[PDB]
């Protein structure tokens, strides 16, 4: 952690099924052919580690 927030650590938030790709996650029934947006999510989510947590 650091004063301005340490955001260098990622975790996977979305995946098709249970267990390092960045393929856009299709939440809906509409194919996500390269563009992220509604029901097309980037699969990774950053942590917000701060000295104040």
């Amino acid at each position, epitope marked *: 952690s*650091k004063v*301005g927030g340490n*955001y260098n650590y990622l975790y996977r938030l979305f995946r098709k099924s249970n267990l390092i790709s960045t393929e856009i996650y299709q939440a809906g029934s509409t194919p996500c052919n390269g563009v*992220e947006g*509604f029901n097309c999510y*980037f699969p990774l989510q*950053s942590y917000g580690f701060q000295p104040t947590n």
Partner: antibody
């Protein structure tokens, strides 16, 4: 990657007309909404116009009502914005934007922008 | 109608937080206005950071967040960096697809 490339901007005479165009690549065109934005130099972004995913509906900011027309050709993966009675006041960089959001009113992916100068 | 207000400018020391705000002239900001936030550096096309109130794009630094305050939208930075100097714009939807941009809030780093 996902890209939008707009052009057609030029130095034109006021009172005349100008047709701008945007070519899309890297994604399926017929899946999303297309948005237009203009930015006058020294000013922030304004909103100009939109169009429905299937082309059945168009939408505009009141300031361009009756003056701007939007249509697209999904066979060419491109859209057009044509404006009549183009004003000298309307000097701006026009941007092509792709809207993949929930309501489809605002773009997520933006082109580099084409400069429209009227004189 | 098309009146969206923002604080004209903010100045924040590196590592400090920044709160940018955005509100309409009528009612209050809700998820129904699907608010957007953009960041524009001089000489460049604007980059979208936040969409549909709080969703972040893959190119959006995790430092930014689309929280809501007392009936108005905000964009909060968890730790300002020199790379964040830009004009930020907010965009609100209304009764239809006629978005209105805010005047813009210039954010600089001390």
């Amino acid at each position: 990657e996902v890209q939008l490339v707009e052009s057609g901007g030029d130095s034109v005479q006021p009172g005349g007309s100008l047709r701008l165009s945007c070519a899309a690549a890297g994604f399926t065109f017929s899946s999303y909404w297309m948005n237009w934005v203009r930015q006058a130099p020294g000013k922030g972004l304004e909103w100009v116009a939109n169009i429905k995913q299937d082309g059945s509906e168009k939408y505009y900011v009141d300031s361009v009502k009756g003056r701007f027309t939007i249509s697209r050709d999904n066979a060419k993966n491109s859209l057009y914005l044509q404006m009549n009675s183009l004003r000298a006041e309307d000097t701006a960089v026009y941007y092509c934007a792709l809207s993949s959001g929930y309501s489809g009113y605002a773009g997520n992916y933006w082109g580099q922008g084409t400069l429209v100068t009227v004189s | 109608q098309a009146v969206v207000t923002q604080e004209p400018s903010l100045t924040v020391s590196p590592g400090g937080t920044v709160t940018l705000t955005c509100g309409s002239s009528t009612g209050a900001v809700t998820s129904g206005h699907y608010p957007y936030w953009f960041q524009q550096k001089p000489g460049q096309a604007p980059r979208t950071l936040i969409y549909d109130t709080s969703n972040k794009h893959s190119w959006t630094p995790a430092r930014f967040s689309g929280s809501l305050l007392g009936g108005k939208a905000a964009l909060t930075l968890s730790g300002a960096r020199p790379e964040d100097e830009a004009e930020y714009y907010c965009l609100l939807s209304y009764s239809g697809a006629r978005g209105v941009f805010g005047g813009g809030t210039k954010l600089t780093v001390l």
